[PDB]
């Protein structure tokens, strides 16, 4: 029935093209104003997760816990121009070798670099900002020393303390070797056992553990460390931009300072937590010219290869109609308020250009092959061609729009934002193609009929060769061979289906030969500990009874399966349960603080005030009596009576490290009638983690210790849990269920494609099943290609897969319709008619995107662009072409109905 409205509409547009072009331009500039209005695009690193996800919400809770995770400005450092040197102690019999950067002079130089960074000045708001302004100092205003995890903090970042040398002027009883080999064994002691009782604490960033500062060593022999680590953590507020961009300005200042540091005895490696965003922005800028020149080639082909009489202005007009559809959909979607990811900016114009050029060429070459008959007015020729061809363009474009508009049902944000734009852009494309471009075609027909230079204003060469191609490869000679080869290759891709990869390799996602590739190679080469993991026991636990404490605490007196104990046992088998070390426990150190034996806690005679551990007043008595009931862990109120005193005491040589030092932010204290210990974390670290697989494993198993511990706890219903949080849990959680999301997405596509292209084709089941079955072949073979060229299954590749099928509809759909409706007496005859009539046009929506999908590789060296976008575009152009224009005519010659 569509042929009546299509025909009288073609005659209407041919009649009065002014109304058509004018109105359609009111539409075009109407929607395209939202492009200039909102224009908002999203680039925050939240692009790889949907809100209200598991890891996303857990990130919220940890963002009330200790707030945001700090930004890490790190330096992996080493000395190439020094050798080992051996320490022979006096006089006890043993020997300890010392690695290359363990030489004292190299340590001195590293301290010079460290002090050079310690006062680095950046200017924000025409003001002054140092590292002291942005670093996180735990203690304030007492001891605002910046947290710096370097080995030199064993000597308090001071040369005069590094050059202690107990011993007469011949023998050495204790030098830096000794203090080092004692601190890396008890790095929270304030008194060395021998050397003038030097402290192993630091300019307090904290008790410096040797995994955060030493690398390349072996097996608890820290004395052979081949590369030191200097970690400046800096506060990283998420809900504030003044302080954030302050820290970022200082970070690029740091990056430039390290890029320009002359020291022939050192080989550095560095990273500020703004390095990856800045280096990705830098990365996707070298190949923009190459994309533009690709589009230049494609537009040129569209201008010349249509049909000094040719269709140049026509091709330019169709190009502008496609771009008007793109900017129209972008305009309306920005109007309503929609972020516009870069993936969309890359995938959308290629798609809308392929579909638009396909419909354009179908219509134009549909008129060119057509011969009028006697009294044919332009209404009754171009309305006839429009009624003859428009059902195919409408079938394809409509199935595509309904399969892309339906792709945005999933939760993955990239494919969401993409598929919306895809749907509306293809629909507006078809509308500006059936309304405006028809009245644009009749006018070039008039121009060519009046004989005025078509640049200044039978069946050509290829219809011949298609007519020669069909019978040779459609005879019963070839007819089985095609099913043989395509079913065989299909089975091959089914074989390498389960053996395909997942994730983004860190070093390849960077412009090779940046300052970041060296960092990744040298953290795989040296470092011994990954990003910290915080084990959050949510608010609501007791913490104030022997039962409640035995559920949580570790070591002596507490249960076998408590939180700390389970984290520690999992730290034993660190190469499986990705968790590296024992957990920094707040309650375990609190119990070793209020000890009546260790004089760390003393309260006044009546005033009940905490007594500074260095005080001297005979009125502070025991916080807990040494009565056998007293010399015990504080159950009940006494707990809350002394916990805030612990979370205030700063390090004292007559006591420990104090609670303010490390656990002041690790323990939330809610003053609600009258004191409680809600929402506390236990911190440890995360082994290696040098590939996407490693990250996924760490996520799985850390959450496994989570649910596992929460099981061993007496949970009243499900109130609170014990979840783990690291920096990366939000980004590598898509891969936790990408396959279920792939299967679904593509699946829904092949459903929509199946529904429309079956009801649109006269409720004919077999035409659909054959067509979208061939498209399923396209996608499975596409996964085989993914295996062969080694591309991954992330959000980008999945988006390009959905779009890949949506573009395969443009190959198989037109042929399927052209065969389904025809009155030839044979299956083979209708196959030749369909393939010759439509295949000659479809192979002009192919050659342009191939000749662009060649220059795409030509000048673009970005590994992500060359491996993902180029090889996939190529894969779906060649794969789709060969599956719609080679196999499908054979499968239809076999099972195509009559
Ligand atoms: C990394 O450091 C390890 C520190 O323990 C070290 O083991 C130690 O190796 C030295 C080698 O000089 C042994 O010193 C030995 O020197 C005399 C020289 O004749 C030998 O006869 C003896 O074996 C003597 O022990 C240390 O004794 C040894 N330390 C211990 C506790 O056994 C590793 O060899 C170092 N490895 C690397 C790759 O650097
Ligand atoms: C998990 O893997 C770790 C490395 O991936 C591994 O450390 C490596 O293994 C041991 C240290 O335990 C050292 O191998 C050493 O074995 C004996 C002592 O048991 C000594 O003769 C030598 O020190 C020998 O080299 C490796 O040097 C060490 N590698 C590095 C880079 O430090 C862990 O031990 C593994 N943990 C478990 C629980 O298996
Ligand atoms: C925080 O660090 C500074 C230096 O970074 C410490 O200053 C040192 O003070 C003691 C004197 O009592 C000596 O080690 C040196 O005179 C200083 N060292 C340097 C490098 O200047 C300061 O004491 C630290 N603050 C606390 C509370 O420990
Ligand atoms: C920064 O401070 C250090 C001492 O902490 C000093 O040696 C250096 O000259 C200072 N640099 C600038 C630019 O102020
Ligand atoms: C900052 O302000 C001062 C005077 O207020 C001016 O002299 C200086 O040029 C400003 N800084 C920059 C970078 O323009
Ligand atoms: C601990 O170190 C200090 C140095 O400040 C020293 O005075 C004190 O005697 C040391 N303690 C012991 C028990 O040696
Ligand atoms: C390290 O380099 C400095 C200057 O670059 C030089 O004075 C010193 O001698 C060097 N030390 C070694 C061990 O090469
Ligand atoms: C803790 O001890 C019990 C015996 O009381 C034992 O059965 C259980 O396996 C232990 N837990 C772990 C994690 O080994
Ligand atoms: C502290 O108070 C008690 C009250 O029983 C008193 O006996 C004691 O003398 C007081 N402390 C001093 C140093 O006087
Ligand atoms: C006790 O400690 C605080 C800070 O730790 C310090 O300011 C105070 O002076 C100390 N007590 C005395 C009596 O000095
Ligand atoms: C959790 O794993 C531990 C092994 O460490 C075991 O004691 C406990 O039974 C597990 N929880 C459940 C619900 O199986």
UniProtKB/Swiss-Prot annotation:
Its main location: membrane. Changing residue 318 to R: Loss of function. It catalyses: cholesterol(in) = cholesterol(out). GO terms for cellular component: endoplasmic reticulum; extracellular exosome; extracellular region; Golgi apparatus; late endosome membrane; lysosomal membrane; lysosome; membrane. Residues 39-287, 334-343, 410-417, 498-741, 790-794, 860-867 are lumenal. GO terms for biological process: adult walking behavior; autophagy; bile acid metabolic process; cellular response to low-density lipoprotein particle stimulus; cellular response to steroid hormone stimulus; cholesterol efflux; cholesterol homeostasis; cholesterol metabolic process. Changing residue 594 to M: In NPC1; adult form. N-glycosylated. Changing residue 533 to M: In NPC1; adult form. A cysteine-rich N-terminal domain and a C-terminal domain containing a di-leucine motif necessary for lysosomal targeting are critical for mobilization of cholesterol from lysosomes. Interacts (via the second lumenal domain) with NPC2. Interacts with TMEM97; the interaction may decrease NPC1 availability to the cell. Interacts with TIM1. Interacts with SLC38A9; this interaction inhibits cholesterol-mediated mTORC1 activation via its sterol transport activity. This is NPC intracellular cholesterol transporter 1. It comes from Homo sapiens (Human). The gene is NPC1. The chain holds residues 334 to 1254 of 1278 of the full protein.
